[PDB]
Amino acid sequence: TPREVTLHFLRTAGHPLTRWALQRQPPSPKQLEEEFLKIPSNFVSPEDLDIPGHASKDRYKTILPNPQSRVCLGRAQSQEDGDYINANYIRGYDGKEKVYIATQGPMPNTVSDFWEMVWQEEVSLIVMLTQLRECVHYWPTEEETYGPFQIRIQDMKECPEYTVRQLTIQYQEERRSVKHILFSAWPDHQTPESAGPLLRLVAEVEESPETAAHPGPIVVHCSAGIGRTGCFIATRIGCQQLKARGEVDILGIVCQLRLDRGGMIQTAEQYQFLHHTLALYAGQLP
């Protein structure tokens, strides 16, 4: 029962850290390495997905969306011949459902699928994590059509650590705003240069105006949709926990992310960086 073993661990593991312990007596680097190694991947095998031809829509053969939380494309706006995108709904703070969608960066052949997801899920914020040297330019310079959708850029603002683009997406009579944040200087399998810029990115997300009665998920993506995406989501949830409760269970956060999409947070170094980042955020709280 390895699957039962995996699920049991992920559903029950935890290591609560008070604000004090996080700042002043955190687990040692060796303890964090051993802890990280114990967390199961919850990767799905090709056998657990019965979606013909999905492989042409995956950037990586072994990184697949867990079927239980996979975003299914209903094709309400198109005639495309299946439902597949490599993306999962991700729970947020306190287990709130569908706070995020974690997904891979679109491939040339999945750009239309990506925008179809953005429309279907009523997404108004996209967070893109990348490095300068690296993913396709799936948004236009001025205006472009992707399948049935017209996308226009209304504004572009360069901040020290990220670029904010204000886009609109239109289908027939309806046009919606979408804020797009591109955070560069985050290399694959590595951490950001320091935590400051990451926390400013999280604040930028937080301050993003919400209009909808039932806010759609925030799309977060990077090349594979698991390492950097998981670090970003875990950071935001950890900040929310610290602010609301004055403690954070980082092991628990990572376990819950893995239930939602296998493999979230790729390296022990990234896991240790989460502890560093959150210790920094803790100092900002009253």
UniProtKB/Swiss-Prot annotation:
The modification Cysteine sulfenic acid (-SOH) is found at residue 222. It is found in: Cytoplasm; Cytoplasm, Cytoskeleton. The modification Phosphothreonine is found at residue 1. The active site is at residue 222. GO terms for biological process: MAPK cascade; protein dephosphorylation; signal transduction. One of its GO terms (cellular component) is nucleoplasm. Protein phosphatase that acts preferentially on tyrosine-phosphorylated MAPK1. Plays a role in the regulation of T and B-lymphocyte development and signal transduction. Monomer. Interacts with MAPK1, MAPK3 and several other MAP kinases. This is Tyrosine-protein phosphatase non-receptor type 7. The gene is PTPN7. The chain holds residues 66 to 355 of 360 of the full protein.
